[PDB]
Amino acid sequence: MEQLTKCEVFQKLKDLKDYGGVSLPEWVCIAFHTSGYDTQAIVQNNDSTEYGLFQINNKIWCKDDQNPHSRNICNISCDKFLDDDLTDDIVCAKKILDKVGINYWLAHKALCSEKLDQWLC
Ligand SMILES: [Ca+2]
Known part of the structure; x- marks a missing residue:
């Protein structure tokens, strides 16, 4: 396995920022x-x-x-x-979001709606 830190993920996912309207904190x-x-x-x-x-x-x-x-x-x-x-x-993640939506990962649960600033690096 290869676990990254929250900050590494934040930097690595930069190009997903605001894609489909999904902020970086949400992607993290x-x-x-x-x-x-x-x-x-x-x-x-x-x-x-x-x-x-x-x-x-x-x-x-x-x-x-x-x-x-x-x-x-x-x-x-x-x-x-x-x-x-x-x-x-x-x-590929962009395609999934474009095609199926954020629920591919969230499954109708609001896990990334509140205190989003907690996911900032
Ligand atoms: Ca890869």
């Missing part, structure tokens, strides 16, 4: 709640696997050995979301 909050800042996090379910900081699934967003019949919307191999370069992770 999303990252904390999604993978605890672990860029190598992998979570398995019966029919799918989620990868990295943004926990992008191999059912619709990326392709891996477990599911080669993935829609591969982000057109990339999931293992790409397990390294130190968040560049492609960010490119």
Whole structure:
């Protein structure tokens, strides 16, 4: 695993600032709640696997050995979301937000609405 600090996440996610109207603090909050800042996090379910900081699934967003019949919307191999370069992770996160919305990560819960200044570095 590779856990980052809150400040490292803040700096690394700069390019997501205000994307879709989501402020930087919200992205950091999303990252904390999604993978605890672990860029190598992998979570398995019966029919799918989620990868990295943004926990992008191999059912619709990326392709891996477990599911080669993935829609591969982000057109990339999931293992790409397990390294130190968040560049492609960010490119794909924007698509998820554009397409499904912030609830891909929040699941209808208001986990990143109050005291947002707490997620600032
Ligand atoms: Ca990456």
